Structures are given as structure tokens and as C-alpha cells.
């Protein structure tokens, strides 16, 4: 495979898709202010397991629209009525209860609530993810919910179709009652992030009752990541987890008994 690699500025290229790359992507961000708009586009050989998608949300009077689309074969990236609640953490419309209506413009796109929450500290790290987002869209696995958390992250998605089906209060992790299961937490590589002494037991909350182990590659520059934590049923499948951790070619394992998912219970390679 070879894909079209277009930088945001306009500058293109033809990329020889590297080992296990296998997908052409076109990602499009379109912003619409009052009567005013722009759009950015990147393109590249991407990880397989990706898939077409969309996200859109009001923040103030600004309306952001994400879309990304994928296709099988060479240089395919080369050419050219449902209501939901909307808000973001850009303008703190989510935390400050400024929720707005957002009519979806498509048949297939439904109400969404997404939580990206990183703990960490300060500088380099903690991706620029809005961390609370609500609006129309279609995303991996869909209608459904899934989540993960571990000692330092909480990801959650709620996908559904009914008028304002995504309303409700902002969904914070310590607002979700312990479920009784306890699973190892860690995240990095057997050297760092998930060495024996950084990996430890934690209290699963809310719907996340399965102990998770995911191994994959850390496609933002390699290193072959590992992740342990508390997953929902859903996240344990269809590589939904990759999107949270931006991982490629993940093998995930999900045991339903407390404290399985210990390191020495792993399958591997």
C-alpha cells in the first residue's frame, strides 16, 4: 500500500505505507463561526482497525465538525434529522451547564457524550483532548457505552439515538460507585509504566467491571505499549480501546473475576 500524505498546509506527497500500515486516511476538521469558517485536512497511511466517523459540537456559537474516513486500496484518499445535546470544555459550557441543542445533519449520526480524562501532571503529556464533549456523531462500535479507567485516566463514550438521549449531568469518575471488582493498573512498557513495581491493584467503579490487559503498539512513535485497568464489557472488544490510547494492533484480554489480569496470568507475543 501507498497512500497520499497531505500536510495540513496543503503540501502533499505519496507515502509508501510502512510495515502493517494498511490504511489510507483523510481527516477533516471544519470550524464554523458566525458566518465564518475554515477547514483543515490531513492525510496519511494510518493504522488498520480505523474507520469512518464523525463528531460535531457547539461550543459558544462555534460549531466544530470532525470527520475521518478510511479506504482499502492505493491512493484512495487522493481525490475529494435527529436532535442531540451539545457542549465542550473549551468554553466550559459542559461543566457550567450551558448545554445547547444540536440538530444532527445525517441519518446515521446519533447523540454522543465523550469523556477523556487524564490525570498526570502539567507539561508534556495530557493530550489536548477537550475532555468533555457532547453532540452529534458516529464512532467506533457505537450505540452503546463503554469506558475504561485506571490509576490515571478515565475514558467514556455514550452512543445512542433518541431526542436529547445524551442529556444529563457531567460524568465524573468519583461520581461512580465502586463495583466491587479490583484490577491491576499500569500503562507503559515492561520497563516503564508497567514494570512490576508500577503495576498495582485498584478499585473499579461504575460499569467497568472487567479487568483489562491490552498490548499493542504506541503508533505515536512505537515502543509497543501496555495498558491494565477497569474496562466495561464493550471496551473489551472491537479494539475500541485503541482510540483512547491511540494504539495500533491491540490484543485485549478481559477477565471478570477480581484481580485476574495480574501480569503472570498474561498471554503474550
Amino acid at each position: 500500500l501507498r497512500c497520499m500524505q497531505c500536510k495540513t498546509n496543503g503540501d502533499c506527497r505519496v507515502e509508501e505505507c510502512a510495515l502493517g500500515q494498511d490504511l489510507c486516511r483523510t481527516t477533516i476538521v471544519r470550524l464554523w463561526e458566525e458566518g465564518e469558517e475554515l477547514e483543515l485536512v490531513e492525510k496519511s497511511c494510518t493504522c488498520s482497525e480505523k474507520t469512518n466517523r464523525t463528531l460535531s459540537y457547539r461550543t459558544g456559537l462555534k460549531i466544530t465538525s470532525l470527520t475521518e474516513v478510511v479506504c482499502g486500496l492505493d491512493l484512495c484518499n487522493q481525490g475529494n434529522y435527529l436532535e442531540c445535546i451539545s457542549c465542550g470544555s473549551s468554553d466550559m459550557s459542559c461543566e457550567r451547564g450551558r448545554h445547547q441543542s444540536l440538530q444532527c445533519r445525517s441519518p446515521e449520526e446519533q447523540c454522543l457524550d465523550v469523556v477523556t480524562h487524564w490525570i498526570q501532571e502539567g507539561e508534556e503529556g495530557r493530550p489536548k483532548d477537550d475532555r468533555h464533549l457532547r453532540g452529534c456523531g458516529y464512532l467506533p462500535g457505537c450505540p452503546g457505552s463503554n469506558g475504561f479507567h485506571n490509576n490515571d485516566t478515565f475514558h467514556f463514550l455514550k452512543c445512542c439515538n433518541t431526542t436529547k438521549c445524551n442529556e444529563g449531568p457531567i460524568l465524573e469518575l468519583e461520581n461512580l460507585p465502586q463495583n466491587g471488582r479490583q484490577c491491576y493498573s499500569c500503562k507503559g512498557n515492561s520497563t516503564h509504566g508497567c514494570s512490576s513495581e508500577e503495576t498495582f491493584l485498584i478499585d473499579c467503579r461504575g460499569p467497568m467491571n472487567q479487568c483489562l490487559v491490552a498490548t499493542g503498539t504506541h503508533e505515536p512513535k512505537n515502543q509497543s505499549y501496555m495498558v491494565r485497568g477497569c474496562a466495561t464489557a464493550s471496551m473489551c472488544q472491537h479494539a475500541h480501546l485503541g482510540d483512547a490510547f491511540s494504539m495500533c494492533h491491540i490484543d485485549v484480554s478481559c477477565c471478570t473475576k477480581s484481580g485476574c489480569n495480574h501480569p503472570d496470568l498474561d498471554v503474550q507475543y
Binding site: N9, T27, V29, R53, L66, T67, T116, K128, D129, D130
Partner: protein
């Protein structure tokens, strides 16, 4: 590293190939919050001119710095310093080479041509 300028905290999304972009201030525009929406006059050499001025002295329009033709020329939006320079995907008077006042390439007959632009300075 987080690209933007002026105000403009930058934002990304895990779902969409972790693509990044800027949340912009009231008086600013552009991918990188670069374009200065308010400013009318120029500030000197007009090197640091950002505001959005399209036409030129004869009334003709500037070609976009990202246009196929302006990509032949010396100053275009594909070059490493394009951000720094003030060269975006637009047709705005710009003075990247430190000429007298800001200019832009303007299609005259069959060739792109520099043309001193509109926009009086403060004076």
C-alpha cells in the same frame, strides 16, 4: 509545540488521528490564530502585517498564497517559514521579503506579478 499564536490554546481529538487545532480569540482567525481580523492600517515596513486585505492599488485581487501558481513563486504557503511569514491559505497583502510596503502576487495577463497592495498605514 502547540502550534498557535496570540491567544489560542490548542486542542486535539483522540478519535480523529489525534489531529490538533486552535481555539481562537475574538480578534483572531486562521488555522494558528495567525490572521488578525481587526487591524486595518500597517505598522511600518508592514513586515508584521497580518490583517486581511485582498485587493491591490489597481483594484485587482491577490492570488492565494496556496494557489497552484503562487507555489511556483518564491513566497508561498508551502514553505518552512510560511507560518512565521504570515503566508497562509488566503490572499492577503503580506510583506515577507521586507519590501517597502505590503504586496501580493496578482494575476496580470498570463503571469503572476508582484503588486504593491492597498492598505494605508497609520499616518
Amino acid at each position: 509545540n502547540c502550534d498557535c499564536l496570540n491567544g489560542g490554546t490548542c486542542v486535539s481529538n483522540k478519535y480523529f488521528s489525534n489531529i490538533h487545532w486552535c481555539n481562537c480569540p475574538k480578534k483572531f482567525g486562521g488555522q494558528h490564530c495567525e490572521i488578525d481580523k481587526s487591524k486595518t492600517c500597517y505598522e511600518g515596513n508592514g513586515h508584521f502585517y497580518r490583517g486581511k486585505a485582498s485587493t491591490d492599488t489597481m483594484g485587482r485581487p491577490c492570488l492565494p498564497w496556496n494557489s497552484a501558481t503562487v507555489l511556483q513563486q518564491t513566497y508561498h504557503a508551502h514553505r518552512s517559514d510560511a507560518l512565521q511569514l504570515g503566508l497562509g491559505k488566503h490572499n492577503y497583502c503580506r510583506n515577507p521579503d521586507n519590501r517597502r510596503r505590503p504586496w501580493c502576487y496578482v494575476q496580470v495577463g498570463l503571469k503572476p506579478l508582484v503588486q504593491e497592495c492597498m492598505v494605508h498605514d497609520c499616518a
